[PDB]
Design a protein around this ligand. Structure first.
Ligand SMILES: [Cl-]
Length: 271
């Protein structure tokens, strides 16, 4: 349009991945100029000046980068910061997050629409869909452990000796199920502090944690010494899988690889 090339800011790591996956840092139609701190992939994202954590944005910092457009994840906030950006006349297009493959496909087509690169969107979607079918095939070939879907506990983080764990309506729950496994935690949504009682009942076969969470707790031995973890199937077998948080949980264009990778890791762990 008459605005020419647009300066774009992206909030949400998977959105940034989507943008970069359509055709690099700057194209004829747009240039990415800023992001929130969760946008660490690929190297071009990591390079962008950052304007706060995605839930604690600096509206002033963001506006100082003179955006024409902001692509914002469902998690972008707080509301007063978003409102200040819109009030300065900047277009803010917000995406949904449903933690499923269709929701990623909507990010692909939605971001490509917002950036006026329909053809690039369609090409990326076709690649993504081919890769997704392959990932489905890889998972379907063999259940990790070779029997019924194994029980996996996802730890986000710890406060002291207490782990914060994923129930339903989470990225982790969806990823565990895409990889042919079952969430060891059932009966609640979102994240909740894990009680040793809930943990004994959950009886995980594998503990899954992000690289960041593993570092925060002090490593593998530290994690397994968390109260209650030893006396579980995973603890007895010392069965831990780590993956990078953005890659594991982001629900972006690497979803097929992320699911293949989680399934490989769980499969190795349950050899
Ligand atoms: Cl791997």
């Amino acid at each position: 349009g008459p605005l020419g090339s647009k300066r774009v800011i992206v909030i949400g790591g998977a959105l940034a991945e989507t943008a970069f996956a359509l055709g690099g840092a700057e194209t004829p139609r747009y240039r990415l100029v800023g992001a929130d701190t969760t946008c660490t992939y690929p190297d071009a994202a990591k390079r962008l000046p950052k304007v706060g954590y995605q839930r604690a944005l600096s509206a002033e910092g963001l506006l100082s980068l003179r955006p024409d457009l902001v692509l914002a994840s469902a998690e972008a906030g707080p509301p007063t910061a978003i409102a200040q950006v819109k009030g300065a006349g900047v277009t803010v297009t917000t995406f949904d997050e449903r933690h499923d493959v269709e929701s990623v496909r909507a990010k692909i087509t939605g971001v490509a629409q917002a950036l006026d690169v329909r053809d690039a969107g369609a090409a990326l979607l076709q690649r993504f869909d081919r890769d997704w079918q392959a990932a489905r095939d890889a998972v379907a070939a063999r259940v990790p452990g070779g029997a019924q879907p194994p029980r996996v506990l996802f730890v986000l983080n710890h406060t002291g000796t207490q782990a914060l764990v994923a129930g339903q309506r989470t990225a982790a729950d969806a990823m565990i199920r895409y990889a042919g496994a079952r969430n060891a935690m059932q009966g609640f949504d979102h994240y909740k502090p894990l009680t040793t009682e809930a943990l004994a009942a959950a009886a995980p076969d594998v503990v899954l944690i992000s690289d960041e969470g593993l570092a925060a707790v002090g490593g593998h031995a530290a994690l397994l010494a968390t109260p209650g973890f030893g006396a579980t199937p995973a603890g007895r077998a010392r069965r831990v899988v780590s993956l990078d948080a953005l890659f594991l949980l982001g629900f972006g264009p690497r979803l097929p690889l992320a699911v293949t990778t989680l399934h490989r890791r769980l499969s190795d762990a349950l050899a």
